[PDB]
Design a protein around this ligand. Structure first.
Ligand SMILES: O=C(O)Cc1cccc(OCCCN(Cc2cccc(C(F)(F)F)c2Cl)CC(c2ccccc2)c2ccccc2)c1
Ligand SMILES: O=C(O)Cc1cccc(OCCCN(Cc2cccc(C(F)(F)F)c2Cl)CC(c2ccccc2)c2ccccc2)c1
Lengths: 241, 232
């Protein structure tokens, strides 16, 4: 690896780590999960869903801040930064969620200590069409066994996707993406020099994330039909309105 | 390149050319409402022709008939629109900004609008087409991309995803080696190609939205397309 590729990876990893520290700091601010008689009532379902929207709000805000720290992001015009973040945020959340899936327990751990089973998501009113694919994707991500440098680079590559809607300088976005693809290629070559299909398997995950983003749109659309509104920051990125 | 890999690549290239060479009669291309439905009927029929090619090509991709019938159907259902977009990109002429079906039938961005397709559908297909032309894939690269697209284990309703992924592997290896030997000083060739598979997933959603917009606009897919793209 060149010094510049090493610097680049260190920057992304360190920025990610500041984001994690913020999550740990805000865990005490989150409205506790109802550990109630869990009486299959309408009230506690709303409380679970609301508690989940707060985790999502935390992640959406960290993603905004992380992207300013990604070398090159600030060279794009503000309208393209917005467009790239609009589209890639849900995909980055899915990657960060897969990274926190525990295949042994079949549970996901957000923030510092908040851990959730399949049925926990079901209990917040999320549809099976949403839950099941996210868990499939997470266990697929685990088989690759990505480290910190690999997750971070994948995320940067995801941010600089030139086929997002409303992008005004798509060629420019592709040229900012290329150094990240290059660093991921060189890094995987050096780390597992005898698994040559690892690199293309990682990029295939970018493909899966597009489908999941679609699934997510249908979930939010099912929310509109159920009269469940999202909080302002989430509504701002994901509702058509 | 090993003999097994040359065999497989050549098989795809020759299959692709024989599917093309062999492929009929169509509704004449003719602004009134009768005329909208006309142009639309016309393109619907060109799309059926393409579906027939793709289906015939898939059953000749080594690996495809090793799968159960259910997975065969599931992978074709999902792949068809994506391969069609790939074939459409291939028939884009950069110099005329027009797309040519079947040697002869030629159309511009306007022609697609005059047949009542969303602009939200047309503009992304033309963006993809021209991006695909910059990449300049050769016959082997296209063929191999298509086979890789077919064997995506994450399609809806796949029963044996581990098997589908196992079958995708040798096509991915063959594309890696082909690009290393045929373009040795373009390191990112290979990943740029795989990144088109990402674009295609999103184009697939855009297409579902266009199918949905036909449903509320009282515009019916003909039965062979309906079997693929309508719900229920
Ligand atoms: O944990 C951290 O440190 C920061 C972080 C990183 C990633 C995710 C995260 O919180 C996610 C909270 C759980 N979640 C909420 C959610 C996300 C996106 C949209 C919606 C909504 F629009 F539907 F409201 C919701 Cl409710 C759900 C989670 C999930 C996991 C497993 C099955 C089903 C759902 C999820 C969904 C989409 C993307 C990522 C996670 C905090
Ligand atoms: O010409 C050949 O040799 C065989 C061939 C190869 C590729 C395409 C093809 O048919 C062209 C049909 C044009 N088309 C119709 C269409 C395709 C897919 C879905 C739908 C529907 F769901 F809307 F019904 C339609 Cl109407 C549209 C075409 C297009 C190009 C550019 C802008 C807008 C639309 C297209 C759309 C999607 C995928 C491929 C082509 C025959």
């Amino acid at each position: 690896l060149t010094a510049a590729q090493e610097l680049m990876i260190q920057q992304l990893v360190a920025a990610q780590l500041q984001c994690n520290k913020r999550s740990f700091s805000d865990q005490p601010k989150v409205t506790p999960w109802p550990l109630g008689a869990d009486p299959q009532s309408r009230d506690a379902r709303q409380q679970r869903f609301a508690h989940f929207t707060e985790l999502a709000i935390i992640s959406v805000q960290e993603i905004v801040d992380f992207a300013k720290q990604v070398p090159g992001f600030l060279q794009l015009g503000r309208e393209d930064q917005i467009a790239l973040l609009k589209a890639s945020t849900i995909e980055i959340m899915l990657l960060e969620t897969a990274r926190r899936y525990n295949h042994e327990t079949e549970c996901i751990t957000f923030l510092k200590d908040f851990t959730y089973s399949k049925d926990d998501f079901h209990r917040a009113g999320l549809q099976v069409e949403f839950i099941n694919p996210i868990f499939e994707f997470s266990r697929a991500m685990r088989r690759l066994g990505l480290d910190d440098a690999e997750y971070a680079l994948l995320i940067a590559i995801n941010i600089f996707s030139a086929d997002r809607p409303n992008v005004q300088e798509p060629g420019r976005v592709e040229a900012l993406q290329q150094p990240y693809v290059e660093a991921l290629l060189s890094y995987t070559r050096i780390k597992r020099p005898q698994d040559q299909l690892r690199f293309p398997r990682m990029l295939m995950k970018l493909v899966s994330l597009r489908t999941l983003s679609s699934v997510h749109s249908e979930q939010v659309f099912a929310l509109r039909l159920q009269d469940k509104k999202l909080p302002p920051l989430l509504s701002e990125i994901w509702d058509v309105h």
